[PDB]
Enzyme design. Structure first.
Site, short mmCIF file in Angstrom:
data_model
loop_
_atom_site.label_atom_id
_atom_site.label_comp_id
_atom_site.label_asym_id
_atom_site.label_seq_id
_atom_site.Cartn_x
_atom_site.Cartn_y
_atom_site.Cartn_z
N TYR A 163 0.49 -1.19 0.12
CA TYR A 163 0.37 0.08 -0.41
C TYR A 163 0.77 1.47 -0.04
O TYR A 163 0.51 1.91 -1.06
CB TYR A 163 -0.95 -0.19 1.53
CG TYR A 163 -1.56 1.39 1.54
CD1 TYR A 163 -2.59 1.23 1.25
CD2 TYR A 163 -1.13 3.03 2.28
CE1 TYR A 163 -3.28 2.58 1.06
CE2 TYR A 163 -1.62 3.79 2.52
CZ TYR A 163 -2.72 3.44 1.27
OH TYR A 163 -3.71 5.09 2.00
N1 LIG Z 1 -8.47 6.65 6.24
C1 LIG Z 1 -7.44 7.07 5.98
O1 LIG Z 1 -6.28 7.76 6.74
C2 LIG Z 1 -6.47 8.13 4.33
C3 LIG Z 1 -5.43 8.63 4.58
C4 LIG Z 1 -4.63 8.75 3.50
C5 LIG Z 1 -4.98 8.15 1.99
N2 LIG Z 1 -6.12 8.10 2.10
C6 LIG Z 1 -6.75 7.28 0.81
O2 LIG Z 1 -7.85 7.80 0.61
C7 LIG Z 1 -8.62 6.86 -0.45
C8 LIG Z 1 -9.91 6.25 0.05
O3 LIG Z 1 -9.72 5.69 1.37
P1 LIG Z 1 -11.18 5.31 2.38
O4 LIG Z 1 -10.16 5.37 3.84
O5 LIG Z 1 -12.80 5.94 2.16
O6 LIG Z 1 -10.95 3.31 2.32
P2 LIG Z 1 -12.27 2.73 2.56
O7 LIG Z 1 -11.99 1.42 2.16
O8 LIG Z 1 -13.37 2.79 4.03
O9 LIG Z 1 -13.60 2.82 1.09
C9 LIG Z 1 -13.24 3.08 -0.39
C10 LIG Z 1 -13.34 2.33 -1.51
O10 LIG Z 1 -13.13 1.70 -2.09
C11 LIG Z 1 -14.03 0.30 -2.70
N3 LIG Z 1 -13.16 -0.15 -3.52
C12 LIG Z 1 -11.85 -1.27 -2.97
N4 LIG Z 1 -11.60 -2.70 -3.11
C13 LIG Z 1 -12.25 -1.44 -4.67
C14 LIG Z 1 -11.35 -2.37 -6.21
N5 LIG Z 1 -11.32 -3.67 -6.39
N6 LIG Z 1 -12.83 -2.44 -6.49
C15 LIG Z 1 -13.73 -0.87 -6.28
N7 LIG Z 1 -13.88 -0.91 -5.21
C16 LIG Z 1 -12.81 -1.03 -4.72
C17 LIG Z 1 -13.84 -0.19 -1.12
O11 LIG Z 1 -15.22 -1.11 -0.77
C18 LIG Z 1 -14.87 1.43 -0.31
O12 LIG Z 1 -15.85 1.19 -1.25
C19 LIG Z 1 -7.47 5.53 -1.01
O13 LIG Z 1 -6.67 5.97 -1.69
C20 LIG Z 1 -6.67 5.11 0.61
O14 LIG Z 1 -5.34 5.00 0.28
C21 LIG Z 1 -6.91 7.38 3.13
#
Ligand SMILES: NC(=O)c1ccc[n+]([C@@H]2O[C@H](COP(=O)([O-])OP(=O)(O)OC[C@H]3O[C@@H](n4cnc5c(N)ncnc54)[C@H](O)[C@@H]3O)[C@@H](O)[C@H]2O)c1
Ligand SMILES: NC(=O)c1ccc[n+]([C@@H]2O[C@H](COP(=O)([O-])OP(=O)(O)OC[C@H]3O[C@@H](n4cnc5c(N)ncnc54)[C@H](O)[C@@H]3O)[C@@H](O)[C@H]2O)c1
Ligand SMILES: NC(=O)c1ccc[n+]([C@@H]2O[C@H](COP(=O)([O-])OP(=O)(O)OC[C@H]3O[C@@H](n4cnc5c(N)ncnc54)[C@H](O)[C@@H]3O)[C@@H](O)[C@H]2O)c1
Ligand SMILES: NC(=O)c1ccc[n+]([C@@H]2O[C@H](COP(=O)([O-])OP(=O)(O)OC[C@H]3O[C@@H](n4cnc5c(N)ncnc54)[C@H](O)[C@@H]3O)[C@@H](O)[C@H]2O)c1
Lengths: 254, 253, 253, 254
Positions: A163
């Protein structure tokens, strides 16, 4: 629907009617993007592997929201989902490469199969999605791509090498894509969150740990991400490309 | 007959076991020759068998060439295990093998992308994973990831290669933290435009790099190797997580 | 008659008290006009009295021009205190005043260096120091330090200006940490080559920036102001310690 | 003298007889530079405001060490100290801008007088010293400048704004000087230490705190700095310019 978070009071006339596409839109941060753009009156398409979550969200957000089922590992279906969007509304205006999987994994534990899978859900789609929307954008002379980045690789965060390495990959893919597509009017930037509270005791402690490490002593939530995304999408950021915009309450600088 | 690459002498490199991927030609060859000149035991991997054999034969008994296509992780693992069988735990890994062939954004298929990532990135992770336990048992080790300024300068027309290189920039930091408690330091060696084996077309391109550089001379493989020796030696024992850029100022324009 | 700079409307900016140094002309003027258009109370400092007076008169009662030479810290302090006396604690400080006149490395005297640092860097610290207690009492505040890509791109021929700008890059991070527990966010706004008021010589230079940029159009003061409005508003409430670069890709070449 | 630390076993033939100049050479890290270069058989001049410390060190290191009394705030004396070095041995080969003052100070406490003084001992000399040695270097067609940087501003370290801001200033002065002087054969880089143990109970705790925060679990000392300085000085780094080289055991990435 007043039930669904608008995320900001700001109003961006330049977002009205623009076509927006968000991968992993049905949950967490992706859902907040979907909500925030719809509230600005964009035409918002999102992709997600969770069909019943996607259907619920499109139902809640109404006719300018479109949910297309998609597993981003399947590049074929991803290009089909793009083509459908362009068929219904025209060329995409704003692509947000958001889908990702951040399950933890020790370096010694990582098998070849795991590494390839993780790279496919974390990195490879963002490339092919940008490849798919680009020519439509170029035809129009304009568009915007946001790559969701992470401060995790910047802070050398251990225990999730596939990741963090994908996130590091996108940092570079933003710069080079910016150059490759800028002549066509397409700007590309990376939105880089810190520790965003979502829904994905010891929780309270972990939350306090972030606040103690951050410069600003409150937690970030999905709204903070969407507020940055709207700016990066709008005409307000028309001269910004190739860059990272980090929304992390100072957690990356410690 | 051999390029020694420096007159510097690093006593700490004597007898250290050094593993280099894509060691038979170009930059990787220069590493091979430079570490052999310092008295190290140098094992290198390459898919070009004839080039590898010749080089090991020319350098003698402290060089070992293992045939290996780095996309094949099982073979990569086997080559690591055989190095460890002959000489013990690796001291110094240099993740070097790459393919930087040009390709337009518009034309990249799924299959090209997967292969280009496998040649350019994946192996550096698995090679690190293979040498880490042997390093940890001994309590010391160094890894060097060959990076590139191309992604930093937003260079177009080779998206798989630049994105891989940007991947390793992050992989350096995170593995540095994950393994440093075991005594393993990890850094990236980041070259600029390295000269390697239309005359006017070549001469002009080479002049363009000189014109854009801060230092007005072309870099070569020796410049790389002299940085690698420092990054392998006890002189850099406290450096980890970092990029070290040898580019005559090409990245700052 | 006035440049509004955006059609975006930020309700969170209404009534906020905004202080801008070097606000009478160029970029600083664009900030002044943009925040006034959002309904903010905007105080600006400038040594050009005639330009400042005209601008305050043209913009009306929610603009306040205070004459000030930012090298004079006592006057800077006095201007801050008077803003706080009229409208209360500053909400938004923009450290903008700078002089970017060219000067060769070889020719710089002690006195030039001291003055150029005083015009370009020192005041941004003291202005922050002056607005911080009023911000802390209220529990909120934002500071914006105007940065530059010139030091990032290693631009020669103006060492005092680039070194100041690089100074503020660090001052942003450290003040962000030192004051963020008081609710004060601090970021740097980093423009590229901004067009501001030999025709061929000018046209050619402007074309050269377009040729080196990723986006093929010239940036202007409005591009700056639209970023500043976001960095001042509640839309950026969780952003601190950071650079935000508006340069059409000029810094990545 | 076997009493004085050689700092490395490595041997750099390209350093033999080169003229090296180090500001704040009589104590701590500056002393380790002075020792390490003398051990490689350079002709080493150093400047320091502590005369009796400087005299002791020149006496201990012998005839290829030269101690010139200097308060770096006085640019006049700094240019004189340079001219003396060039008179005795020729043009300087290697300049290390090391003198600095890192006393702690709360932002609210800082007076104009303090800020100006701190900028003068922390930043302004490095510029004028590089200005002084440059033309001699250019005449020869070669030389090397090392600016001592700090990870403190990178980590947003609070409570010492004049010192961190000067260090941030030098990060930028390295890049632009690199460009301005590179055509003349002069390379300039910044050496950037982490938490270096020196001589400048609760000490043990603070030391353990660094080890816990670092990636490599041992303390850095002045030797680690000098080992990097010798590489940056030598012909081994002849293609490296404009860059930071950070020796901090991973403390900047956390
Ligand atoms: N949580 C944090 O603090 C944080 C920090 C930095 C970056 N991010 C980034 O933010 C973005 C969103 O993350 P999040 O925390 O909301 O994640 P999450 O997993 O809570 O939700 C993300 C969505 O992606 C979907 N998904 C996963 N695999 C998939 C696939 N193969 N095909 C289609 N959909 C798919 C999940 O089902 C969900 O609907 C990502 O790019 C993550 O790297 C999050
Ligand atoms: N040439 C430059 O200007 C330059 C610039 C920046 C970075 N680099 C980096 O330098 C490193 C060395 O590059 P180079 O320029 O000598 O490259 P090169 O392509 O000339 O040589 C790389 C070597 O790897 C071997 N190789 C390639 N694919 C392999 C595989 N699948 N299995 C085994 N061996 C394989 C080749 O046979 C060759 O011996 C690379 O990591 C590259 O990213 C080079
Ligand atoms: N023009 C560009 O391309 C560019 C690029 C990068 C960064 N910037 C930054 O933009 C900011 C605004 O720059 P600009 O290009 O409009 O500059 P400018 O020189 O045109 O205007 C700056 C303003 O500051 C005022 N001023 C200057 N010295 C002063 C002093 N001692 N006391 C009071 N007022 C004083 C001037 O009178 C003028 O109104 C600066 O911080 C500069 O570093 C500009
Ligand atoms: N201590 C660390 O962990 C660390 C970390 C990062 C950077 N550094 C840097 O390393 C360098 C050396 O620091 P140090 O810890 O050895 O400092 P130190 O104060 O222990 O010794 C530095 C020397 O500079 C001298 N000096 C101070 N003011 C002077 C003046 N006006 N004129 C001449 N000489 C003067 C001191 O007397 C002393 O001889 C500095 O550039 C500092 O920023 C240190």
């Amino acid at each position: 629907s007043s039930g669904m978070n608008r995320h900001t009071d700001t109003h961006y006339p330049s977002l009205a009617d623009k076509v927006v596409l968000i991968s992993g839109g049905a949950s967490g941060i992706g859902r907040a993007f979907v909500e925030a753009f719809v509230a600005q009156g964009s035409r918002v398409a999102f992709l997600d592997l969770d069909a019943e979550a996607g259907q619920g969200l499109a139902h809640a957000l109404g006719a300018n929201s479109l949910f297309l089922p998609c597993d981003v590992r399947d590049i074929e279906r991803l290009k089909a989902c793009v083509a459908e969007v362009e068929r219904t509304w025209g060329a995409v205006d704003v692509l947000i490469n958001n889908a990702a999987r951040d399950d933890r994994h020790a370096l010694a534990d990582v098998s070849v199969e795991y590494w390839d899978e993780r790279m496919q859900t974390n990195l490879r789609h963002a490339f092919f999605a940008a490849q798919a929307v680009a020519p439509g954008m170029a035809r129009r002379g304009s568009g915007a791509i946001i790559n969701m980045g992470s401060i995790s690789w910047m802070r050398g965060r251990p225990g999730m090498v596939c990741y963090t390495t994908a996130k590091a990959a996108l940092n570079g893919m933003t710069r080079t894509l910016a150059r490759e597509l800028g002549g066509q009017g397409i700007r590309i930037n990376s939105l880089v969150p810190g520790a965003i509270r979502t829904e994905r005791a010891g929780l309270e402690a972990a939350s306090q740990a972030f606040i103690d490490q951050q410069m600003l002593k409150f937690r970030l939530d999905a709204s903070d991400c969407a507020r940055l995304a709207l700016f990066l999408a709008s005409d307000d950021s028309r001269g910004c490309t190739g860059q990272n915009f980090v929304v992390d309450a100072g957690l990356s600088i410690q």
